Amino acid sequence: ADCGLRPLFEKKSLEDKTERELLESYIDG
Amino acid sequence: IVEGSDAEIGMSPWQVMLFRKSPQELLCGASLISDRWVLTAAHCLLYPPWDKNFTENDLLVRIGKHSRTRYERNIEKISMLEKIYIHPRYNWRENLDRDIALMKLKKPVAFSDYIHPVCLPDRETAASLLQAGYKGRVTGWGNLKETWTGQPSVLQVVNLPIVERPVCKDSTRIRITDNMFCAGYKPDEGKRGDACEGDSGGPFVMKSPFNNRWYQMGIVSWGEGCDRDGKYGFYTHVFRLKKWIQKVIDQF
Ligand code: NA
Ligand code: NA
Secondary structure, eight states, X not given: OOTXXXXXXXXXXXXXXXXXXXXXXXXXX | OBSOEEOOTTSSTTEEEEEETTTTEEEEEEEEOSSSEEEEOGGGTEEGGGTEEOOGGGEEEEESOSBSSSOOTTTOEEXXXXXXXXXXXXXXXXXXXXXXXXXXXXXXXXXXXXXXXXXXOXXXXXXXXXXXXXXXXXXXSOOSSOOOOOOOSBOEEEEEEBOOHHHHHHTOSSOOOTTEEEESOOTTSSOOOBOXXXXXXXXXXXXXXXXXXXXXXXXXXXOSSSSOTTOOXXXXXXXXXXXXXXXXXXXX
16 A cells, blocks of 8 residues: 555655666666 | 675665574565565475475564664564465475465564565556566575575665576576566676575565555575576566465455
């Protein structure tokens, strides 16, 4: 239900040190 | 986990440790998917080749943990297990097909900044995210290198891309099924890393670019050594076995 959202990261609009690398992996060919 | 790095704090608040009660021993990783429900690899609980055959009473989980070489007062919660459920088509004789199990907690755990459930993928989440070249995250307190049958102080994390089904099959003589996927960098991709012995039952998770939620796509299952050129880690395919998890969950 309210799963998948980390109190210390998403719920505080804060990003971990390597989460952009995963999103970049989706856009790259 | 090999060639990973220290998790930041509350980076993986669904991370669960699975222990033997006596003598107190860290067996495996797990993942929290509800207040009552913990998910792990079937071979953490039942593998007759290692005369391993744990019941509910034999075991205990520790949730919200970051260091094993600390005790984390008013942060980490410990829970006994009411029932263990192994996939009825779990196959240890051959290739660890459906290497999945569910443990139900005696008391529902309290959610905190350090304890929070991971989502399970739907149809579309599996379609959009479980594709070759797309990167998920693996975590655990497992072995630091390949060795014979590497304990780190801090929870370990590595991002690894999913690998095309044909390169997975070419890597190994072990028969793989639809209920599994493989992840890791090709030799001559330049990056490295892998799960390892001890990391089993730990989650392979991906961040949906649509709703910002973390989903558990895989369970650390098997490999040959850890982090070898031309080998990849094999993950239990969480979507293909979701209906079973649901039968078990929709039935208390
Ligand atoms: Na893409
Ligand atoms: Na490798």
